[PDB]
């Protein structure tokens, strides 16, 4: 009922979401992620439970940013709603992930939040340690 983070993803990035489940749930971090295609029951109002899960039942929200995520309206809503809870990002609530290269622009409304970048080969080592640490805090 209480998760550590809600995972905002478009269907195309399900591969990386499952890699996240392996890396954060099924290891010593013992984190509890909310994945809509696994944990959200059918018959729920896509907007009502999105709002209910992200605001009350999930402590933070991780957003998987890609070219395909920009074309998702379900994600767009979820991201703008996540930003509403801390416009200034004082609560360190919205966690942007970049896992692969993007031909298109990083969302304008997210441009002053520290991205967990998995593309840069020189920083990749600290990606999982930093992300797990971010989700583990109150």
Author numbering: 159 to 296
Recite the paper's sentences:
We previously observed that the TIR domain of MAL (MALTIR) forms filaments in vitro and induces formation of crystalline higher-order assemblies of the MyD88 TIR domain (MyD88TIR). We demonstrate via mutagenesis that the MyD88TIR assembly interfaces are critical for TLR4 signaling in vivo, and we show that MAL promotes unidirectional assembly of MyD88TIR.
Here we present MicroED and SFX structures of the MAL-induced MyD88TIR microcrystals at 3.0 Å and 2.3 Å resolution, respectively. The higher-resolution SFX structure (2.3 Å) was first solved using the MicroED MyD88TIR model as a template for molecular replacement followed by iterative rebuilding and refinement using a different protocol compared to the MicroED structure (SFXa). The SFXa map showed well-resolved features, including water molecules that were not modelled in the MicroED structure. This is especially apparent in the region encompassing the BB loop and αB helix, and in the CD loop. Analysis of the crystal packing reveals MyD88TIR higher-order assemblies, each consisting of two offset parallel strands of TIR domains, with subunits in a head-to-tail arrangement forming each strand. Based on the SFX structure, the intrastrand interface involves opposite sides of the MyD88TIR domain, which together buries ~18.0–18.6% (1500 Å2) of the total surface area per subunit in the structure. It is composed of interactions between residues located in the BB loop of one subunit (BB surface) and the βD and βE strands and the αE helix on the next subunit (EE surface). The interstrand interface buries ~12.0–12.2% of the total surface area per subunit (991 Å2) and is composed of interactions between residues located on the αB and αC helices of one molecule (BC surface) and the CD loop and the αD helical region of the partner molecule (CD surface).
